[model samples]
Target: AAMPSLDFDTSVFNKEKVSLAGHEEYIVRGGRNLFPLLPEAFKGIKQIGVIGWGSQGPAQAQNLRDSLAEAKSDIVVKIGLRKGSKSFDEARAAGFTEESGTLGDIWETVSGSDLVLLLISDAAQADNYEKIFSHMKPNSILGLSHGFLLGHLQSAGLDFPKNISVIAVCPKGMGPSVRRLYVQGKEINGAGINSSFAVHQDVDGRATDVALGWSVALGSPFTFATTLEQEYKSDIFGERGILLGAVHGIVEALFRRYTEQGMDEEMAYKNTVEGITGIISKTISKKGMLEVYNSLTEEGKKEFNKAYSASFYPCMDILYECYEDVASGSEIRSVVLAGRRFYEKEGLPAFPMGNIDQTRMWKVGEKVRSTRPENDLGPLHPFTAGVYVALMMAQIEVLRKKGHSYSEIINESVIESVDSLNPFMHARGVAFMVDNCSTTARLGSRKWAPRFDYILTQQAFVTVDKDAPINQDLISNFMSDPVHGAIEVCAELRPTVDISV
Candidate 1:
């Protein structure tokens, strides 16, 4: 099915753009009294305690306080750490020296707080929550970029303490980017902000409105309403198997294929970094790939069309298999399991923050793998994973107002039902990937082998330096590997003379 296009009005709301309507009644019987506490969470919101002044904490904490100040919002940002932690000095030098505080009066902070943003490592999450959960006042919202706590609450039967709500507004970019973009006189502009929102126990009736408010303040592109399960499964799995791992793995293999075939190493490297990836980004951002091709000569256009249709389409078909694996939760389970074993089993930290230990993540992975009922491929994994997770999150936001169970809202049939309803898909292309030395030997004889057809002149083979970017002799003696990383392209222009120049 084709997607519908909508127009926008400059004066009013844009139909084409996403929007949200706040809760109708604005208040509910069980809803905690937010109006009374507004003075404190706002004016007294002084002493903004930030734990873990690592990469994200220091950058975002500084940005939030700065942005707030620019808006003429008076808010003091404080860094919290262990008694003798060294980060305190760094925070002091950064200008929050006087406000810096330890977790000495954690209970007072939690009980008197307007907002508590948990920026600690995942390994410390379970214990951190245990420390603060009991003291938290009703309507004291908790904020998280990652949804690790969702898993904990869901596992415990949505049995969280009354009067609190869990809201998520995750920025897609790294912490440095988030802080830098805001400081660069430019807003996130939709690229860096992809927030997931859920109201895990809106004891205070303002769960819906509050979640929406959080997303807006964070500058998220779209308010993705999702549950903890959907966020956890898709976010982690997509990063591991589909987005990061599988894509990297495939490209690396392809690069090795070319280098082994006596192709020029520079050709492979240039083709990938500057060729395929750049074109796709340009096409997607500008008009489209077809539009870009239309600017070329007639015959060149036809040939380009033919090549894309035949080669790229087939590659997409193959990649679709991987996408199916991603959506079905099979690939997700496998990658998570592998990551868990690699990190948790060996006692290495899984995330940058290291809050939640997640040692049992392997067990969860095993459950997802052994139990994800296999059937027809049906559709691609990216589509399934994307839609399924998006819908699940949306449902959570909606159900929060109605007072529903996280488990009841997110079941198997529910996943399939909404998943089938969403209509969005993507494609893949053919290219070579050139990686570092450790990855070269893996690609042996694939179609997109790492071959660089030089223009002529045997002198190209003579190089004096041991540190040249690429060397012909290196290719000659190196073990075969897949052509990996980026893809570079080579095009020729010549009148047909029995296919000879």
Candidate 2:
């Protein structure tokens, strides 16, 4: 077993169920009570070491500093860095000062700390974890933002060190929002990321409390429970399929199709990029997924139903394939190997989401955005609505097949996009956010996004018979899918403030 399963008392927590659907679930109370309980939850630990200055490092470390300082907990937060890092100035600018003992070398930080958050890349952790463990104090808590390290360690045919307590506080928000909302949370008390957590190895039995405490300190508005394996599979899979990869692939293809027809460069972008982020995602965030269908015109409905039937099943097969790779370690191994390859030759920051606005569609998007609020983004069109909802439903089905909890399925597939990734993609462009993700996600998106694009352009849209009857089966499955009810439950814990980029 990756981690030993144990029971906990549910009475104290506000036990709630996702009961609208038949396959109901319980999401025990999270941020509602926990913020008040932070002082008690974080009883044992003192010195805190935040390892690495990657995407998540600054946000998480800063949030910890601000939250702990606000509480006057006297718990110190420090950043551990490699010598000669380009990130030194950025970290210093954020106020992690060597002069104040808030910044230090990685080795020394690990040696002195009671809790250590390994916020480095999945690849870096795979390479240096043993060295880190060698330097750590016995029986200390090991924190992970993603479960990537657990999956990588498992693939290497090794067991985690029994001496340490391993736990994860995987944020559903983007890394950027960890600090973004933590800052926002000051005025809006409920403003912060919604995180899922787990105690992988409870060495001292207090690991659960420590994990929850860490989550609260980082300003998680809600903290639910999840296993490390579940975290990596759903998170990694979502990023590849809908959140980044599929969106990138679909947009690219749609742009080509629109331009090939009478539409100009700006018009093509309006239909695809502007269509998804501006129209589709915005509606779903305000309303729900079905509303995207409900609000469409009669002609649009025919297109949506046709496109939904053609694409949903085919794309689901791809999502399942992605899921299998994640579960069996093929994807995990791919990430591990890819990182090693880059670090040795091309060097780190290997697949950065560089200047995507240089692309034609985005250059046009720059113009479209400046005048966005003035223009009325009318109801979503047939081709765009049909294809997008189809891809989303397919991804949701795959997550269901993996037997993830409804909260997991809804958050990763539907809510995360509406709340996190899509907004960022909306604020910037898709690739800037998509390309800025992990190499695994970048690789996955590049590999699988094209498949989504090809199936839609070549197969799904091309094969639609306009004269033929509607596929009510597709409509029935979509409208009645338990996800709608689940979304309502999720909304109760959804972030209070949003970044609708």
Candidate 3:
């Protein structure tokens, strides 16, 4: 027998996140999948009832209507927003009619529809859709732009309605982009679709087709092909850690430090978004960042030359720990659990929604109007690429060894570890547990702890891949090597010291 290839195309790992230059139409074209995942009898299905209207509600309803219209397809799109809601008035203003009725009559509209799309806010979805649950027909399919309901149910360990099948066709982009891209005859960028098809209660014979039809309607490009567990964990934890908290905290600290050190606020802002950081980002966006750094000023070249060498040393250790923790399913939990609490209690800046939503909004309004080339403060937030690549690679290492669904393997200690890193102390005790668990996990090896385990006596500079090397170089120039060993001196600490955590 022939041996299989050992070499792997690692890029396939992010096949889900390729740049959305022109793939929006591919998803749109795939939208003719109404009932595609369901049975043949439901193929010519008609009415689509979109429930609720808010930030996501109206936007999705409008996009669905527009997509159907552009297709010149004969599909009825009706909306059921809350009665006397700002959304109801807004939908009307946005041109919704009997085709999309006010909230007062949502039950009737939903009961009469073939498929119901849940687009209500997370807080109110359960109560708002309570009426539609029992009223749904045996074969009636339920669609969602998000799986908030499923997450809520899973968290509570409650059973979903069995009579109706559930399908999630979440566009990685926001509602406006969904509509905008459709109208432009261009595919919505980042309109990556996360689809989950479950026979929750599959009372209908063809639940799968009904579930699939929604994906077709939205034209989701490159569906993630996941389950409730994977989707929920990815959506929930992604919003918390790399997507929001740690990266945000790191940048905010850098900005605050710049301001404290007497840098002009405007200059700080420029550096934060479009200076060295921005230039680096822009260069990397066009080519890869590592490659872009090679084409720098001599000063920069010399600095990076020394820096990259030193930086890689620590990264090798850090990354190894990260990989081991990911493999053991501990570190990711810490990062995510801590991140979620931070997200809920404090929230992210400018664009507080999940990173995906933030990215869409930034691209939709700011990308075109702004003069800056590196204002991609949403999905491409400075550390966004780092976190994604690092985590994915770390997880990949775990998968290669012993197959784990990341979702199933994560422990509560991971949550405890992250919480311990919380910026604010007022939220809850989640962080305390996170810290304790993280310590125990890291205690597996003394080397795993540094910034994490030890307290910094001096004003330690927080640095990552690029900055780490610069810091090391600064230290090296002041120290000398001895014949027996590298000469160094340790100084006693003052009785009283104040260092920011």
lDDT of 1 by residue, 1-501 (tens): 211121211111111222112111111110011223222224324444556666666765665565444445545555556556667667667776544442323355556555666776554564466766786666666667666556554544554566777666554444554455444324323232334455555554554554444343443333444555555544443332222333333334333434556745544432332232333223312332223344446664443333222222223333334334444545434433443443454556553112111323222323333433443112111211221222222323233323323222222112211121110111112211111100111121121121111100011122211222332332221112111000010001100111000
Rank the candidate models, highest TM-score first: 2, 3, 1
- Tell me the RMSD of model 2 versus the true structure: 3.5
> Which candidate gets the maximum lDDT versus the true structure?
2
What's the residue-level lDDT of 208 in candidate 2?
79
Model 1 global lDDT (CA atoms, 0 to 1): 0.37
In candidate 2, which residue pairs clash? 426-501, 427-501
How well is each residue in 1-501 modelled by candidate 2, as lDDT tens digits?
A: 122222343322344545535554545444433555655566678888999898789888987787666566777898998877778788899998899899999888999898999998787888888898888788988899898888888877876788998889988766776777777777776888888887788777777777777887778777777788788988888888888878887788778877888787777777887778767987887777888888888888877888788777767767778889888888888877765655335444555323444777777878877776644452366777777888898987777766676677778888887767776666767666777666667767766777777777766656664444556887899999878876776777777776554
Score every model by TM-score. 0.52, 0.90, 0.55
Q: Of models 1 and 3, which has the larger TM-score?
A: 3
Model 3: per-residue Cα lDDT over 195-294, one tens digit each? 3333344553554445444554454433334444444444433333222322233234444555677976545544433332234333433333333334
Off by over 4 Å in 3: 1-44, 70-74, 99-104, 127-129, 186-205, 259-264, 275-501
Better of 1 and 2 by TM-score: 2
Tell me which of candidates 1 and 3 scores higher on lDDT.
Answer: 3
What is the descending lDDT order? 2, 3, 1
* Global lDDT of each candidate: 0.37, 0.76, 0.40
Best by TM-score: 2
